[PDB]
Structure formats: structure tokens, C-alpha cells
Design a protein around this ligand. Structure first.
Ligand SMILES: Cc1cc2nc3c(=O)[nH]c(=O)nc-3n(C[C@H](O)[C@H](O)[C@H](O)COP(=O)(O)OP(=O)(O)OC[C@H]3O[C@@H](n4cnc5c(N)ncnc54)[C@H](O)[C@@H]3O)c2cc1C
Ligand SMILES: Cc1cc2nc3c(=O)[nH]c(=O)nc-3n(C[C@H](O)[C@H](O)[C@H](O)COP(=O)(O)OP(=O)(O)OC[C@H]3O[C@@H](n4cnc5c(N)ncnc54)[C@H](O)[C@@H]3O)c2cc1C
Lengths: 571, 571
């Protein structure tokens, strides 16, 4: 049985192995080594990098770029014996939180390189591939890029058109295609490329086109790139089209198994996903400091504005979002470091949650700052511009919601359809829930623990009813799936903060009473959202009218090409 | 008694004079004259103005600027006999919807000039002031600016420090101060300036400092400005500090009455406010066309994406927001044109609603577009950058919510405190709601009309209970006031669309059944938000715990200077 909390909750089970107690993974030497890196990495971003300059120049300044290579920042998770820093996922999370606090354009360049660009070599490379490629990737002598998206294919990776055709000898493949919006596409010398190949069925020999992943060197020939694309934010990161024209790729440069490229791509994206939430937890930490500074020092209506309830509630909401996001990021990284094999729903939740949280936190920082927040000099508007893409790339949040909902439903649907389905033998065959977090949550958080268990039961009841009603047709019920994904996001958020705050209380940390407050305040409102949301799905007699009207209104818009009504004057 | 719907709803009354039937104000000649302007103004924005170029140059191109003057666009509401186009508020709304659809940087420059910059001359000018100043304002030979904000004072206008001191003869005032973030500050030759003056009490002679408004000419001497400030969006608009150093202002340049400058400022802002919603209804119309075009033509997962429910719901929500905003804008403009004196709550609602709606619509257009939406070339990201300021200037939306809530409570609180308060004479003194929209809403919208009446009753019940509980101390209950303002916004939104769609049904317009659908879909969810929101205020036993925790969490953040917790590792 799965050890995933998210898998269990869709079945009405409390599977807590990967949640409680809040995981601690580093040994004493790993902790001290990480401390000795945090200091120089922080100083580098404080004293050498200039995020406003990189945004103005639409590139990373050369002194910063070379300094990052010397710091080891292009190879943080590459083993030391292969030229890297040798960090585990939790150690990586700690350093990317520094990068995300300071410069998301630098962060995307380093993440595109190592979180996804060569990550497939770390996960699937042969010994020969690792030894050949990793040392120069880790030094930054060869930058990497993840080459999946094409003009025709973004969310639907299975539809890619770039092709790789084997030679008669089988010594190489000829690769033809183009890729779109590739981070580092104009800088990279190593590309992880996904392309359709003919794959021979091992039993019958029948040939079917399937995706295969390849390690491609720019020096193989036939590779060019377009100019840097101009964009709203993360302007220091390079984004370019990459063109492959008759590229000879050696057969030993297949990454993983021929015809398993889709799984390779998905595993790379899943594996890298926690780093987003970690970086964005850092973004939020720096933004909250700026908002608090402003509210501490601005007088209006005769008081400093932190004395006004509207500002107090904005600040409290911002820190709860940062705390949830940070807690999710380090939970997933710890699960990975502890050998979890089923964390993909939790990782997707962390990416949706953290990207939307950082957006909302930075938008409210602008609001607290007033007119100043819209100005260029304070730098907050630059962060807001940078953040908009994080809801779109590495999986749009809309598609990730559908993934969360359907992946969570999958095992429950398997169980339900197992019911019945045995043949009947007529010839004489002889043959509350009890759920509780007591003993896992700290006693001072018992009430919020009970809110989480009740919300889990409400959620699982709706999941079951909807799978019985829709069966395999649930895949087409998108209004429903988005609402189930939101319930799942809030439920995981509740248990992550219950777990972290409980450990803080048990260990007597100085901030434990504050963390208990963050947790209870989060849980009261998250439990209300799950209660109201699940009632709308199950017992609301107007919900189906809303769904029919969303479809009818959208159809009317598409027929017209835009708004159907004129203004009230009619012209 | 007030004819305002918003005033009535806080008292549990249905005051419908300014709502039903949806107002029609233009006579046949005004309609034809407006049609003859819509065509050349639209062509000018389609064929002459280039919004991407003005954003790149951080100014309005000279050919566009001169063309706008020749079009009459600097004087749209100035009477023809004073050199303007002579439009009423509804006619103005129609043309600013064109500007807002095409270029919000141009829109803010023209609005800062005429919606607020010289608007006080139209509202309060003497005959001599109007004849002297309006002709060159209307031609654009003299650009105007509204000079209220200072480094110390934004939301709290009463706290301004710029001073104007009368001469011994009383022939002039000497003006000293500085103003911050003034739209057109570096371009204007006419400034509406708010400054503190000594004001003599007419009965006793005692002198008190109060604000006075002045018409100030750049040529009076002593006026300089700072360089254009760089900002996230509306980059074509000029924003500059304005400095007043020993400026001699003739006494006949007082605008309105000495010591009534705060009221003048507030009346100017209130009077101009509907133009924001009108412009932003146009912004949303153009953005919805772009989103619909994208969803019509993008194939993913084997279908055009408008076939997927997630996209259908996003599109349907976007058009409902555009329709509500547009309907509010033309309702308020019509009320003004029909001589309403009490429309300030409705105008503030329209500004909060329309600015937040346009932000949300444009953010979702980016999401529908995927990666393309983050790129510069499509132009959507530029619109999103432009829109962020509209939640802040002309009154921050947070302060406008407090205004809506407290202004609505004011007459109800007056009524309640009248209860009792008569002396008792012990010596022998002898001496459902019924509310319905039936007959006002169209019969096909009767159910949504009943939802609105029930929501009004729920709202008014809470307003009464909270005024009894808090009395004059309600001014300090900001968490509550923000939630009451949200209820008021949704209630006005419901009645505005019920009124517009009812007229469409009664008149048999071709889009009436579609409008009925927009209205019912809006009303079902708005009624649910008011039901749940009012229950949280009245009958929820955890609401007070949330409020206490928002204050405690914010206090802990201010004490620390930022997030209190470390990350889970503790360093
Ligand atoms: C700055 C930048 C950097 C990038 N870096 C890289 C990189 O390094 N490597 C890489 O390979 N790619 C990269 N990308 C591409 C990025 O991952 C894609 O933009 C993303 O996957 C979305 O694809 P799309 O833009 O084609 O949108 P589409 O997939 O066409 O989606 C359009 C919209 O429809 C929705 N949608 C799609 N299908 C469905 C469905 N079945 N049901 C409901 N809704 C649906 C989507 O959520 C979205 O809202 C980058 C993009 C940008 C902008
Ligand atoms: C591009 C631009 C153009 C502008 N154009 C002009 C112009 O032409 N003329 C002009 O006069 N001004 C103009 N302004 C100034 C603008 O109106 C002010 O920025 C606005 O009034 C807010 O004031 P502030 O920035 O001082 O914020 P503050 O008033 O200091 O507010 C800071 C924050 O605290 C909140 N807040 C304040 N008081 C309270 C309270 N009592 N309770 C709860 N919350 C509170 C606010 O809502 C905000 O979130 C412009 C500004 C910009 C950025």
C-alpha cells in the first residue's frame, strides 16, 4: 500500500508515514556543511549580484555569472566525485530559498540548468553518461536546457512532433524539429531533447511512434537557436527557440529506454518540482520583510499603519501563506531524501500552492506600500513581474489541478470497480470512521487536528460519490475536478502545518506558540473552505445550473469572438 | 429621504429610484452626436496611437499627442461655448471606454487632465474662472494636474502640509510646499492645488488651519517639477513631484470657499470616479476578445481548448466581471446626468469592483494564453502592468471599502441612536419584511430578484446588530468593515445586473436571453457569498478568534521585522 498521505486521503484513509512527525533528514556533518555554504551563497547575493541590473540588461551580468560558476552553483546536486557540491534535496532546498529570496531570474537560469536541464542524467544516466557529462555541467562549462515544448505542444507533451529516426546500422539517430521557449536555449551546450522515435514491440515487432529522451551536444552539428525572447519578467533568464536540423545523435546518447521518453520527462519535472516551492518560500520571506518595514514606519491618519486592522490581516495572511509553502517544500524534499517513491501529488500541490501564494503575497505587498509599490525603485514590481510565469511553466497550474484530482481518484476508482465484477456461481458456493490524529498531533493542536480529520472525511465522501456517479467519465468533469483539487490542496496544507507546528511544540522551540497560532488560524479557514466546497459539490441544487451556464456562456462568447453584449447604449 | 440604493440597503430598505428601470438618459440628438464621435475616436486609436510604442518610450508620441488635441479629447465635458465637446457623463463614459480598451497610459493622461485636474473648475468655478481657464484646457494648450498627495499624505488628505498664507491686503496668498506622484506634474500649466490656510471663524474670529483649493498657473512663478518617475505600468503617463516655492496666488484663484478645500477635493474625486469603471469595462472588452481568440484557435490534447471546462469557466467568469463593471459605470453616469445628489457609495463600489475585475480578467487572459501570455509581443502583460495602479490611486481600494461601510452605516446609526434619548416625563404623559422586487425585475428574473432581496435582508440584519454592539466604536472594527463593504459590493452588483438584464428582456433585445444567463449565474454565486459572509459575521463562533489572531500574528511580525520562524532547519 502507498505511503502517500495524498493517495490515502482520496480513499478516506489517514496515511501519515510521510507527514508525521515533521521529518528531519540531515546528519550532523550534512548540517555543518550546509551552514558553511549558506554563508558564502548569501554574501554573494547580497554583495555581488544585482537583481535590478540583471533585469535591466536582460541577462546575468558577467561577473555574477562567473562568480556563480566558482561558487559551485551550477552543480549543487552533482556528487562530489563527479565535480559537484554533493547536496541532497533538503540541502538544495535551503540554498534555492536564498536564490529565490534575491533573484528569480538567476534562479530560473540555475534551475533550468540543473533542476530539469541535466536532471535526467542524474536520474537515468548510465555510468558512462554520468562520467562523460556531469563534470562540465557541474562547473558550468556546459550549460544545460530541457527541450520539451514546441509550437504545437506545451501541456500535451504526448503530441510533440520533433522526430528522431534510427540509422540502418543503429549507430545513431537523425533528429529534426524545433523547440519553443527553452530556458537557456541560447546558452546551452547540452540539451535533454524529447523526440518521437519508431519503437519495435519486443513480442510482435510491430512499430509504433513513442517519445524517447536524448542527451544532445551542441557540437554534434545542425543545432541553432533564435534570439532571446522578450518577456514580462525573469528578464535575466535566456528564453529561446532551439532548432534541430539533421542532427546526428549517437545511439549511446539515448537517456533511459527507447520509447520511455514521456516517463523520463515526467519524472524529471516531478523530481525538480519541490525546488519551486523552496525558492518561492524565500521570495515570500524577503517580500514580507519589505511589507513589514513599510507598515512599521509609515504614519497615516495619525498612527503607524501596522496599527490598523486591514494591514494586520494582510500581513497575517501573507505569513501564513509563506509558512505553508515553506513547510510543504521541505516536507517533499525530506520525503524524497528518505526514499519515498510516491510523492507526485504532494509535489504538484506544493508547486500550485507556492506559485499562487507568492503571487498573492507580492501583490499584497504592493497594496500595503501604496503608490510606492507601483514604482520601479523599490523593486517589488520587478518581483511581481518575475512571479507571473511560475503559475505556467513546469506544468500550468490548471493542468496540475487536473493531475492532482485524477491521480488521487485513480486508486479509489480501482477499488470501487473491483466491487462486483467477479462472476456469480449459482451452483452452490458455500464460502464513525475511527480516524484520529490523536498521538500524532501535539495535544495543544488537538482541535485543529480534529478539523483536519473531519475535512478529510467530507472530502473522501464526495470523491467516492462522484466516482460512483461518473466512473471513467470523471476525466471529462473539469469543473468538478478543479474543485476537488482545491480541496486536496487545502487538506495537504492543513496536515503539513499541523505536523510542523506539532514538532515545534514537542521540541519546545522558541517560536512554537507563534507556530501554533499560524496553524490554528490556517486550519480554521481551510476547514471552512473544504466544508463549503464539498457541500457545493454534493448537496447544492444550483451547482449543476452553474456548470451548464459556464458552458453556455463560453459557447456564446466563442460564437461571437468576444463579449456578446454591446454597452448599454447599443453602439 | 435619500434616493440612493446603497444608502437604503444598509437600513434594510429597497430604494430603487436610481436603479430600476435601467436608466436611459440621452435624447435623439445626443445619441447621433455621440455616434459621430465614436467613429473618429475609434479610428484614431486603431490607426494613429500605438500603445506599445508609448510604453516603450515612456511618453505619448508627439503625433498622437497633437492628434488628441485636434480630436477635442482634452475637453470632452467642457461646454461648447467654452471651447469643449460639450458631452454629458454618459457620453463621456462611452468615449473613455474606447480609450481604456486601447491605451490606459493615454487614458490616465487624459483623465488626470480632465476627470480630476481641472474638474474642480467645472464643478466650483465662478463664471470668471470658467471663461478665463476652460478654453485653453479644452484645447490642450494648457494641461492640468490634480495636486493633492504629498510625501507625508496620501490616503489621509486632511494631513497635508503644503501651506498658503494670505497677504496683509488679502490680494494674494503665498504658497509653499511639495506634491508627490502627480500625474501630468511635469506637463501641466494649470494645477488644482490643495493647501492649508488660516480660516477665520465668521462668528468669533478664531483662526483654524483648514484646507483650501486653488487654481494655480505655472506662470505665477516659483513652480518647478522633478523628472518623470519610472514605474511598472502606465509608462506613457507623466508622474512627477511638483514644487511650490514662494508662489504668489491671486485671491480670486481660490476655488470654491476658503476652508472648504477638503470637500472640493472629495467632490472632484467622487465626480470623476465613474470614468474609471467605464474605461476598465473597455479594457476588459478588448482583453476578453484576445482570450476568446486564443481559446478558439489553440489545439491541445486533440481539441480546441474552448472545449475544456476549465477554459469555459474562466471565460464565463471574465465576461460576467466585464458586464457587472460596465453596467455599474453607466448606471452611475446616468444617475449623475439625471441630477442625483447621493451616488458616492455607488461610485466607490464601481471603482473598487471595476479595478479588481480588470486585474482578475487580464490575469486570467494570461493564464489562458499559457507561455505566450507572459511574452512581450502579445501586449497582454503590458495591460496587466498598467492595471495594477488602478487599485491604488483615486483612493486605495482598502480605504474605499472603509468609506463604503462607514458611509452606509451612518444613517442607520443615526436612526438607532435616536431611539430613546428623549427625556422621560414621569408626571403624567398621556400621548416578514414585505420587501419585493416584483414588478421591477422582469418576470423571467423573479428568482434572482428574490435572491437579491433575501441577501439585502441578511446584510441589513448584520449592519443593525453590529451598530448596536459597537456604536461609534464601529469605526475601529476594520476586519468587520472590510467584510461589510464586500457584502455591499456584491449586493449593488446583483441589483445592477438584475436591472440591466430586466430592461433587455422587457425591450426584447437580441442578447436578452444571454444577459438573463449572465445575471442568474452572477446572482447565484453573489447571494452565496453574502449568505456565507453574513453568517461568519453574526453566528460563527470562530470569527472572533480569527480577528484576535490576525492582530497577534501581525504584532509578532512587526516586533521581528519580518517572518518570525526560520525555515525547518533553523538556520
Ligand atoms: C519564460 C518561459 C520559459 C520556459 N521554459 C521552458 C523550458 O526550459 N523548457 C520547456 O520544455 N518549456 C519551457 N517553457 C514552456 C512552458 O512549459 C509552456 O508554456 C507550458 O507547458 C504551457 O504550454 P503552452 O504555453 O503551450 O499552453 P497550452 O498547453 O496550449 O495551454 C493553454 C491553456 O489551456 C489550458 N489547457 C491545456 N490543455 C487543457 C486541457 N486538456 N484541459 C483544460 N485546460 C487545458 C492550459 O492550462 C492553459 O491555461 C517556458 C515558457 C516560458 C514562457
Ligand atoms: C502612478 C501614480 C499616479 C498618481 N497620480 C496622482 C495625481 O495625479 N494626483 C494626486 O494627488 N496623487 C496621485 N497619486 C498618489 C496616490 O493617490 C496615492 O498613492 C494614494 O492616495 C495612496 O496614498 P499613499 O501612497 O501615500 O499610501 P498610504 O495612504 O500611506 O497607504 C498605505 C497603505 O495603508 C493603507 N491605509 C492607509 N490608511 C489606512 C487606515 N486608516 N486604515 C487602514 N488602512 C489604511 C492604504 O490602503 C495602503 O494600503 C499617484 C500615484 C501613483 C503611483
Amino acid at each position: 500500500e502507498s505511503k502517500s498521505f495524498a493517495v490515502g486521503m482520496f480513499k478516506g484513509q489517514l496515511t501519515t508515514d510521510q507527514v508525521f512527525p515533521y521529518p528531519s533528514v540531515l546528519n550532523e556533518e550534512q548540517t555543518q556543511f550546509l551552514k558553511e555554504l549558506v554563508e558564502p551563497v548569501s554574501r554573494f547575493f547580497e554583495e555581488v549580484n544585482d537583481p535590478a541590473k540583471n533585469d535591466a540588461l536582460e541577462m546575468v551580468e558577467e561577473t555574477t555569472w562567473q562568480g556563480l560558476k566558482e561558487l559551485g552553483a551550477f552543480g549543487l546536486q552533482v556528487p562530489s566525485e563527479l565535480g559537484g557540491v554533493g547536496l541532497c534535496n533538503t540541502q538544495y532546498a535551503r540554498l534555492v530559498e536564498i536564490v529565490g529570496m534575491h533573484d528569480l531570474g538567476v534562479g530560473i537560469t540555475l534551475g533550468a540548468h540543473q533542476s530539469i536541464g541535466f536532471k535526467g542524467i542524474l536520474l537515468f544516466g548510465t555510468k558512462a553518461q554520468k562520467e562523460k557529462y556531469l563534470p562540465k555541467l557541474a562547473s558550468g562549462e556546459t550549460v544545460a536546457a530541457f527541450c520539451l515544448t514546441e509550437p504545437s505542444s506545451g501541456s500535451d507533451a504526448a503530441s510533440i512532433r520533433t522526430s528522431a529516426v534510427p540509422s540502418p546500422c543503429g549507430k545513431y539517430y537523425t533528429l529534426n524539429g524545433s523547440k519553443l521557449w527553452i530556458s537557456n536555449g541560447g546558452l546551452a551546450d547540452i540539451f535533454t531533447v524529447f523526440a518521437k522515435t519508431p519503437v519495435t514491440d519486443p513480442a510482435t515487432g510491430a512499430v509504433k511512434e513513442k517519445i524517447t529522451a536524448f542527451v544532445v551536444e551542441r557540437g554534434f552539428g545542425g543545432i541553432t537557436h533564435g534570439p532571446p525572447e522578450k518577456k514580462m519578467g525573469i528578464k535575466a533568464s535566456n528564453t529561446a527557440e532551439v532548432f534541430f536540423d539533421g542532427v546526428r545523435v549517437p545511439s549511446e546518447n539515448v537517456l533511459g529506454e527507447v520509447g520511455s521518453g514521456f516517463k523520463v520527462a515526467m519524472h524529471i519535472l516531478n523530481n525538480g518540482r519541490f525546488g519551486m516551492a523552496a525558492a518561492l518560500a524565500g521570495t515570500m520571506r524577503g517580500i514580507i520583510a519589505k511589507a513589514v518595514d513599510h507598515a512599521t514606519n509609515r504614519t497615516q491618519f495619525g498612527e503607524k499603519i501596522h496599527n490598523f486592522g486591514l494591514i494586520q490581516e494582510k500581513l497575517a495572511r501573507m505569513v501564513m501563506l509563506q509558512y505553508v509553502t515553506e513547510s510543504m517544500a521541505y516536507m517533499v524534499s525530506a520525503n524524497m531524501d528518505q526514499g519515498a517513491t510516491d510523492f507526485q501529488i504532494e509535489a504538484a500541490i506544493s508547486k500550485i500552492f507556492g506559485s499562487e501564494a507568492a503571487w498573492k503575497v507580492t501583490d499584497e505587498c504592493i497594496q500595503i506600500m501604496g503608490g510606492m509599490g507601483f514604482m520601479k525603485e523599490p523593486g517589488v514590481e520587478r518581483v511581481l513581474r518575475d512571479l507571473r510565469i511560475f503559475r505556467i511553466f513546469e506544468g500550468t497550474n490548471d493542468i496540475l489541478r487536473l493531475f492532482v484530482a485524477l491521480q488521487g481518484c485513480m486508486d479509489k476508482g480501482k477499488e470501487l470497480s473491483g466491487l462486483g465484477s467477479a462472476l456469480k456461481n449459482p451452483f452452490g458456493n458455500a464460502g464513525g470512521s475511527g480516524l484520529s490524529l490523536s498521538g500524532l498531533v501535539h495535544p495543544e493542536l488537538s482541535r485543529s487536528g480534529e478539523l483536519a480529520v473531519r475535512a478529510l472525511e467530507q472530502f473522501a465522501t464526495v470523491v467516492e460519490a462522484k466516482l460512483i456517479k461518473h466512473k471513467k467519465g470523471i476525466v471529462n468533469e473539469q469543473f468538478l475536478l478543479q474543485r476537488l483539487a482545491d480541496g486536496a490542496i487545502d487538506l495537504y496544507a492543513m496536515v503539513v502545518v499541523l505536523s510542523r507546528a506539532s514538532r515545534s511544540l514537542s521540541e519546545g522551540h522558541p517560536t512554537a506558540q507563534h507556530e501554533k497560532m499560524l496553524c490554528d488560524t490556517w486550519c480554521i479557514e481551510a476547514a471552512a473552505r473544504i466544508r463549503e466546497g464539498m457541500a457545493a459539490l454534493q448537496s447544492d441544487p444550483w451547482q449543476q445550473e452553474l456548470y451548464r451556464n459556464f458552458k453556455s456562456i463560453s459557447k456564446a462568447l466563442v460564437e461571437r469572438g468576444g463579449v456578446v453584449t454591446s454597452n448599454p447604449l447599443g453602439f
